[PDB]
Design an enzyme around this catalytic site. Structure first.
Site, PDB file in Angstrom:
ATOM      1  N   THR B   1      21.304 -57.041  57.229  1.00  0.00           N
ATOM      2  CA  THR B   1      21.000 -55.675  57.865  1.00  0.00           C
ATOM      3  C   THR B   1      21.982 -55.352  58.975  1.00  0.00           C
ATOM      4  O   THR B   1      22.123 -56.157  59.890  1.00  0.00           O
ATOM      5  CB  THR B   1      19.437 -55.557  58.088  1.00  0.00           C
ATOM      6  OG1 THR B   1      18.976 -56.543  58.943  1.00  0.00           O
ATOM      7  CG2 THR B   1      18.655 -55.809  56.768  1.00  0.00           C
ATOM      8  N   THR B   2      22.576 -54.181  58.875  1.00  0.00           N
ATOM      9  CA  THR B   2      23.485 -53.725  59.882  1.00  0.00           C
ATOM     10  C   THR B   2      23.592 -52.270  59.758  1.00  0.00           C
ATOM     11  O   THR B   2      23.158 -51.730  58.776  1.00  0.00           O
ATOM     12  CB  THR B   2      24.831 -54.532  59.777  1.00  0.00           C
ATOM     13  OG1 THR B   2      25.739 -54.059  60.814  1.00  0.00           O
ATOM     14  CG2 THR B   2      25.474 -54.346  58.412  1.00  0.00           C
ATOM     15  N   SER B 131      23.488 -58.103  61.648  1.00  0.00           N
ATOM     16  CA  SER B 131      24.068 -59.236  60.943  1.00  0.00           C
ATOM     17  C   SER B 131      25.443 -58.907  60.635  1.00  0.00           C
ATOM     18  O   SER B 131      26.361 -59.712  60.846  1.00  0.00           O
ATOM     19  CB  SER B 131      23.396 -59.498  59.565  1.00  0.00           C
ATOM     20  OG  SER B 131      21.971 -59.755  59.751  1.00  0.00           O
TER      21      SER B 131
END
Lengths: 48, 202, 242, 202, 242, 242, 242, 242
Positions: B1-2, B131
């Site tokens: 996740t980013t 991340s």
């Protein structure tokens, strides 16, 4: 109104004049009224 | 996740993964993690899915409420503070979500990160969080100038989520790019973004 | 007698909360203060004539800092001013905390109006019998008058207190919306003279202002207020001859 | 994280390093750890970014409030004690930050150092605070002069931090220095400070 | 005597509460506001003309945006208005918080109405001497009026405030359900125009609406406002020949 | 005169609360509402001739849904009515919540009676001036009256509001216990027409009813009302003649 | 005034609150206490005179230590004053707690005004029926007066109590700003001599002060008292020969 | 005067409070209690005279122990005493709890008048209406009168109850600051006999005392009253020959 005109008439008398002028009437509105309910009082202290 | 964010000259452009994966589990392939906060404010969340939604709704409610009470458009700086204040006061109900609030207002352009532990910091014209961030900062900065248009920005935005996805085994192929150009608030959505990365082949 | 001015909860037959027009009169009897709004800033002028000279001639205060960009001046009980200003200053500082934004003059006005309306609505606690002037520059100059009942009225120029009436007629004629900072200031000082029926002295006035380009509050110091007074005395004298 | 302080005879100069590093993970591009509390008062934090940002805003807001109250700018001491009480009240929210609160007042120049169990303690010499602190004291303490300006304090405040950076891999790069000349609140900002450490290496 | 009117906890011998009955007339003492409904939406018009040169020509406001697709007018105390509309707005935005759905026009006025009902039963507090008109389009336009009791009446065109008597007589003949947006808007301005006995100026009156296509609150700048005011004024001249 | 109507805490030496009897007379200044119970359903008929032409057709509209087999009409303060009708919906859904059983009408009326008695016993507050007709089919059709006091009464035809005295007398003659759904529905319409002193049309009543078989609230449609109106008007015409 | 003086929740038609004006009269029931500020320190002289020789002259005392450089004197109730000043010790200490700073005399006066003001607002409670003289040195001498309302007035030669009227008169004529600490000491003993209308001895009066050079509170031992009174006596005799 | 004695919250026009004055009238109404201080102790004597020989000779009780060296004796409502002294004991123990020091007569007096004042302030509670003469040895003998007002006053020798005036006029002549311990308790028997105007037996007076030399409260038996009782009587007989 009768009292204003009589009272205004009291100023004219004092100043030795038959005619009533504008000044005398406004003086009579002030005179009659003042003596019936008051104006002084008050400022703070704490109400300032 | 980013999630990514960059300041364009005529806009602001940010991006989200529109498919979020963790293990072998996929919650939804039309899960919102991209939030329209007001007309030309957006929020992109990295971190947990559910806490994202729940926090994020209240922040919509605030955008309206403030706009009505002030007789003016809300600022970025108000809402940027606000999320963090809400988050610190409800640490008995903590929301373990990493926000990016950015957008356009009277104040101008700027993108704030809000930590999952509170507090509102300002990033100069680039930001990544999550991340995939570590790589992403460089991915953006290669072609980031301040006079990059909106069209090139969206291209650029994809390449950071694209970078993350290959490294990890558990990121999504869904992606949402958000454009905020002060004339539109366009949500490109998986299809439209998809063909941007079919230039990148995969 | 009435029994409608026994308490706030009691309306008169006239559709009036009789006890809050009496909180209103509380303002009138106290000493006067004038806010004069121009486009080059805002001016705030307020009493220091009060007592004699057994008092400090620098007795404190009618001109309260609320923030560094917002000031206020008061008439009415300055007991009720002391607590109302404490709450106002804190109310403003809360906005800065939870938004990192200066509060706007107008938004501030709504919050203190809401505060006053709490005591107005409840019956077991009396309303405030104080008026507030809030003058600032938030991003344009803005000026409100806050009533003892928590009502909001925006003015071009205003005074409250004893001298209100003299000001109303005076500004009715001369005041323009297109005045200078210098002009508007000198004129409100002319007006302040008339209100107390005497010449000014800089020891009998405390004067503050918020400027458009500075965005800050500053209080004009007695001898920096003295040339302004000096050009204002001419006019005051001219108008007290008649 | 590490922050350094020295008490000059013409002001207070304290310095911070932005960017907070676990080991190679950074959470964002830059991260405020320098707070302007007033034109003569500063707060420089070593700790978590979020906890510091939360508390700092608060401190700023009650500083303004106390100014109005006394009509008389807050002392270095008053801010220090305010801060001890705020941290102990909120010892039910897990906030572990070490603070340096410093500036100029009518009793001189001082810095008071705070730990998150309470405490404010007098330093009129050298104060350094964080995980890089021990190395930092080697530089500061020897080359201390109590006849040092704020202008030779900046040359020194860099060198102390630079050395700490080269002996911890949990410090980043983002060195800011703040300087309080008694006429302003000057922030050098990352760029300028980077150049002082270029002539303290190649 | 009579009343039985010094508390709300005591009913008068007539089966009324005088306290609430004086508060309904406290609306009439307040500024007029006019509501008119058509099928292309519902226009709400409020008098912004209060004061003279001493007061600013923009006095707040008196026609507040409550939700995104809902607005309301106020008549009665300025002070009571300020607090009621703070709560009203909170409640409107709270519905979306918990449901994510537009609050119904009918139901938002109900939940405003419940707050004042509360103030009708507890004796510790007076009811608010204020009437809001609640205008919006939920998906068909609806017009309501809220009363000092907390009473709720569905309207289709209404006046409240000073203009209470006037506009009802005026709408007996004039009003109809097939007026267009433009004929109805204009009819609303005449009706305020009888209330005040004067020709209008777009600079001292504020008009908002929620249309049916949009279903979103909009507000009419004084520049847009001019032609309507012009068409309105002819009929106002016709009134003031009698 | 006496302190006995001047408090709600004081029993008269007549052993009557006059405050409760002036709350009583708060109901009678509400517009008529009639209930008819038949063995085939239970029927609530309510005015909707209320207001002018500037007021909607469906303007209150008294026969609010309380549950899925329970409707209730009101007479009295329209304000106080909304909260009791709302509290009726919650209490009913509470019955559904804590037991999973359809709300016993009898117990719902009991639970409104206890809620209304909190405001009767306490003196810092005031008990609602509303009479509700609680009716529904839980297992057999039932019709009650709940008073301002919060007292439980069983009725099989009753009226409430200004039409009351007329309708009590009408059912003492006409009402029967050998009574069919269509006849009942016709009969109570007869009674409403005496109240309003004028002929019915299906645009000045709302009629709700709760069937046994269906066991649900349904509103009668204007088109569906019409035959019942026609049959009923025959007797109205005869009895408003001498 | 006749029915608007039976509580504190009232405002009178004069704009005055007569319940607060009656509390101010409570102060004149008690004895005079006088403060002087001169440029070298501030001076507090309290009356300690006993009304019977069976008392002990050390409990009708007015002087209370509040901080290591703030003292204060009192007139009003004894009872109210001891609680008022135990609070003022706690407020002063509470500032030292959170800042490590002894309280500015200006700030301390502002705090205790705000405390007294909450006793004036509430209708469950009467104000503190006291006025104070707070005399201290923060960095430079300050002397302030509290009114029983919670209002704040800065003074520079002052008194409260019965003898207040004569001490005002006295400092009107005599008091100038060119006086020393000794010269101001004598004038306050002379102002106490005027008001009791007899000669003093130093066992019926007590002096406390705060100097700026010592920046402390001290209390004048009876030993250090005799010469000030011996000089005063010279001059108290002259006013008993007028 | 009426309506300035109907509340405890209502200050009178004179600054007096006639309620509180009427609570002092309550203290004079009761039985007498006399306190005498000498340098070797402070001796406290209280009337033990009964209405009938049907009451147990010791009626529980007229002299309480509060601390180990602190006693008080009573005049005024005996009802109020029960709670007021109970509270006083807990407070004298609380200081031993939290500092491990016997409380000083100042500070025990202080707690109790502060506690008094709180219920003089509130209008929802009426204050204690009993006066106690608290006696004890700290560093020196101390004798205090706690007034129903909430005021403390220290005395050399004192009285309260119905006999108060008689014993104030007596000690003015006789009382000197040389009196022995034994001659002090005797001098207080003489006083006591004057008030009731009857001779004393040890069965209609109760004496305890506080010795410096023991630094403890002791309770004098009738057996060990007997010599003192005869001695005092010779003098009591002479005052009733005058």
């Amino acid at each position: 109104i009768k009292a204003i005109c009589t009272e205004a008439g009291m100023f004219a008398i004092r100043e030795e004049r038959a005619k009533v002028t504008m000044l005398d009437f406004t003086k009579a509105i002030e005179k009659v009224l003042k003596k019936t309910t008051p104006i002084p009082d008050l400022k703070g202290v704490m109400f300032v | 996740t980013t999630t990514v964010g960059l300041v364009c000259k005529d806009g602001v452009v940010m991006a989200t993964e529109k498919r979020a994966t963790m293990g072998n589990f996929i919650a939804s392939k039309a899960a919102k993690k991209i939030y329209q906060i007001a007309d030309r404010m957006a929020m992109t969340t990295a971190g947990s899915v559910g806490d994202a939604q729940f926090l994020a709704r209240i922040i919509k409610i605030e955008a309206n409420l403030y706009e009505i009470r002030r007789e003016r458009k809300p600022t970025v700086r108000a809402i940027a503070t606000l999320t963090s204040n809400l988050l610190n006061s409800y640490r008995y109900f903590p929301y373990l979500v990493q926000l990016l609030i950015g957008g356009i207002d009277s104040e101008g352009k700027s993108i704030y990160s809000i930590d999952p532990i509170g507090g509102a910091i300002e990033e100069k014209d680039i930001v990544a969080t999550g991340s995939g961030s570590l790589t992403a900062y460089g991915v953006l900065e290669d072609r980031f100038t301040p006079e990059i248009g909106v069209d090139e920005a969206v291209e650029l935005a994809v390449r950071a989520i694209y970078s993350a996805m290959k490294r990890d085994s558990a990121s999504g192929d869904g992606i949402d790019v958000v454009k905020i150009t002060e004339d539109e608030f366009y949500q490109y959505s998986p299809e439209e973004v998809e063909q941007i990365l079919a230039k990148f082949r995969k | 007698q009435m029994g409608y001015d026994r308490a706030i909860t009691v309306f008169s037959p006239d559709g009036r909360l009789f006890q809050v027009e009496y909180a209103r009169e509380a303002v009138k009897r106290g000493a006067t203060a004038i806010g004069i709004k121009c486009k080059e800033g805002v001016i705030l002028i307020a009493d220091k004539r009060v007592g004699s000279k057994l008092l400090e001639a620098d007795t404190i205060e009618k001109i309260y800092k609320i923030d560094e960009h917002i000031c206020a001046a008061t008439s009415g009980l300055v007991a009720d001013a002391r607590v109302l200003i404490d709450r106002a200053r804190i109310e403003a500082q809360i906005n800065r905390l939870t938004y990192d934004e200066p509060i706007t003059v107008k938004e501030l006005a709504k919050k203190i109006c809401d505060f006053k309306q709490q005591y107005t609505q409840y019956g077991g606690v009396r309303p405030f019998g104080v008026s507030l002037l809030i003058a600032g520059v938030d991003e344009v100059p803005k000026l409100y008058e806050t009533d003892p009942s928590g009502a909001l009225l925006e003015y071009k120029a205003t005074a409250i207190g004893m001298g209100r009436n003299a000001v109303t007629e005076f500004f009715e004629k001369e005041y323009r919306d297109d005045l200078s900072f210098d002009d508007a200031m000198v004129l409100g000082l002319v007006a302040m003279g008339l209100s107390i029926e005497s010449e000014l002295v800089p020891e009998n006035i405390e004067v503050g202002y918020v400027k458009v380009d500075d965005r800050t509050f500053k209080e004009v110091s007695p001898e920096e207020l003295k040339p302004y007074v000096e050009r204002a005395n001419e006019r005051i004298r001219e108008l007290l001859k008649k």
